[PDB]
């Protein structure tokens, strides 16, 4: 099925990665990214479009006029806005869950209730709308009830003391419901799968670093780096997770008459008691996408097309084994607070020539130059035989790329390396 045109929604590194990867398919003549960035502007197959992504009527008309085969959604917002359901009733295929099914991410209360209803393991919890009753619960639990979550996508506060959790319940009920749950401990890992509603095809597990500074210090951010596969997870554990979380989530959704299709993301804590779910999401994470998709050997276009057709098992994904992908984000001075914009970037061509992938996040074209246009500017991904080697190879690319006030971490993966 040659000469397909495909559309991706979004404008960060995740969307560059999806575009790059799709463009490799022999089935694909054109990838359009809406609105895209400087990394996707100007390629043999990839280009940007200013089509509105929030007016679903106009988006559908644009899809049919250009004969777009299907739409791929990068970020979570359009999913929760109904993009899939609306494109479908207009006769346009879109990869992703419906708004109803994205409730696994969009409402934390729904997710926790859904999990209790189907014996999916997760931290014990309770929801509140009055803050006084929330304090009562914090103050009188014998387990550490110290994690407070704004139900509607601060958002999440992990307190160390009852005092801090009461303080937190106060801040989140300023500017619905909140969920207070047990503080678990152990290792966090991201477990994704492709799913068509019935079949489940897990991705190899990833980990990322949210903290701004080396050593895991400073403020949290959207993610300063990631790598895949996380060596902390045995094969047994992955099949426990596939059975106990992924297949069980999809089956549960299907059995409640709200089938789940696209990507299911589960954030998981490895406890002494086993795997527990911290949160669901409905799309690739950023910068994890930048380390999972480079590991995919199959044609992504085939995987997606077969997922839309409900024939996921006819085209199971095949992964690169014995390779580790690791990615390191370059960010603008001041991130995650106020940062500078419009700063000229050099060296990303030589970084790629060294055999690395450069995935653009906040970049833009300006007067024949590429300039910073966002907090996270780009990521360099290396694919090698182990973490340590991938890290050091990525760092050569990082040293070639220069912009005024660039920051990045030189220790991505340090814990996985210490685990081994
Ligand atoms: N139920 C849970 N048990 C334990 N950890 C959790 C739970 N749910 C979420 N988390 C994790 O807590 C992490 C964030 O907590 P962290 O220890 O970084 O403190 P923080 O709230 O981020 O503090 P800061 O004010 O510095 O941002 C997230 O990575 C999130 O996945
Ligand atoms: Cl919908």
From Swiss-Prot:
Modified residues (N-acetylalanine): 3
Residues annotated as domain ATP-grasp: 112-309
Chain sites annotated for binding Mg(2+): 279, 281
Binding site for ATP: 181-184, 188, 211, 220
Residues modified to Phosphoserine: 11
Modified positions (N6-acetyllysine) in chain numbering: 341
Family statement: In the N-terminal section; belongs to the GARS family.
Subunit structure: Homodimer.
Entry function: Trifunctional enzyme that catalyzes three distinct reactions as part of the 'de novo' inosine monophosphate biosynthetic pathway.
Entry domain remark: The N-terminal ATP-grasp domain carries the phosphoribosylamine--glycine ligase activity. The central AIRS domain carries the phosphoribosylformylglycinamidine cyclo-ligase activity.
Full protein name: Trifunctional purine biosynthetic protein adenosine-3
Phylogenetic placement of the source organism: Eukaryota, Metazoa, Chordata, Craniata, Vertebrata
Interval of the full protein contained in this chain: 1 to 429 of 1010
């Amino acid at each position: 099925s040659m000469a397909a045109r495909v559309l991706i929604i979004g404008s960060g590194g995740r969307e560059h990665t999806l575009a790059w990867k799709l463009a490799q398919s022999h089935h694909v003549k054109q990838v359009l990214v809406a609105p895209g960035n400087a990394g996707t502007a100007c390629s043999e197959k990839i280009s940007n479009t200013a089509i509105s992504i929030s007016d679903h009527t106009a988006l559908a008309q644009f899809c049919k006029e250009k004969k777009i085969e299907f739409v791929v959604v990068g970020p979570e917002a359009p999913l929760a806005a109904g993009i899939v359901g609306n494109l479908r009733s207009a006769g346009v295929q879109c990869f992703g869950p419906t708004a109803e099914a994205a409730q696994l991410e969009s409402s934390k209360r729904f997710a926790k209730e859904f999990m209790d209803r189907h014996g999916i393991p997760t931290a014990q919890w309770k929801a509140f709308t009055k803050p006084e009753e929330a304090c009562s619960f914090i103050l009188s639990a014998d387990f550490p009830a110290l994690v407070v979550k704004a139900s509607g996508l601060k958002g999440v506060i992990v307190a160390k003391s009852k005092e801090e959790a009461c303080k937190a319940v106060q801040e989140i009920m300023q500017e619905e419901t909140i969920v207070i749950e047990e503080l678990l401990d152990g290792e966090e890992v991201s477990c994704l799968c492709f799913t068509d509603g019935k079949t489940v095809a897990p991705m190899p597990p990833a980990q990322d670093h949210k903290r701004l500074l080396e050593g895991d210090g400073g403020p949290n951010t959207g993610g300063m780096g990631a790598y895949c596969p996380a060596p902390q997870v045995s094969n047994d554990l992955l099949l426990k997770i596939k059975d106990t979380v992924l297949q069980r989530t999809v089956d549960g959704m299907q059995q409640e008459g709200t089938p789940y299709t696209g990507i299911l993301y589960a954030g998981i804590m490895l406890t002494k008691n086993g795997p527990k779910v911290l949160e669901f999401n409905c799309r690739f994470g950023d910068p994890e996408c930048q380390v999972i998709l480079p590991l995919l050997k199959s044609d992504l276009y085939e995987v997606i097309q077969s997922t839309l057709d409900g024939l996921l098992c006819t085209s199971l994904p095949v992964w690169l084994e014995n390779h580790t992908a690791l990615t390191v984000v370059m960010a603008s001075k001041g991130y995650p607070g106020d940062y500078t914009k419009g700063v000229e970037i050099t060296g990303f061509p030589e970084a790629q020539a060294l055999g690395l992938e450069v995935f653009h996040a906040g970049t833009a074209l300006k007067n024949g130059k590429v300039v910073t246009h966002g907090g996270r500017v780009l990521a360099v991904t290396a694919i090698r035989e182990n973490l340590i080697s991938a890290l050091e190879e990525a760092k050569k690319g990082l040293a070639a790329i220069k912009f005024e006030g660039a920051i990045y971490r030189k220790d991505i993966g340090f814990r996985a390396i210490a685990f081994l």
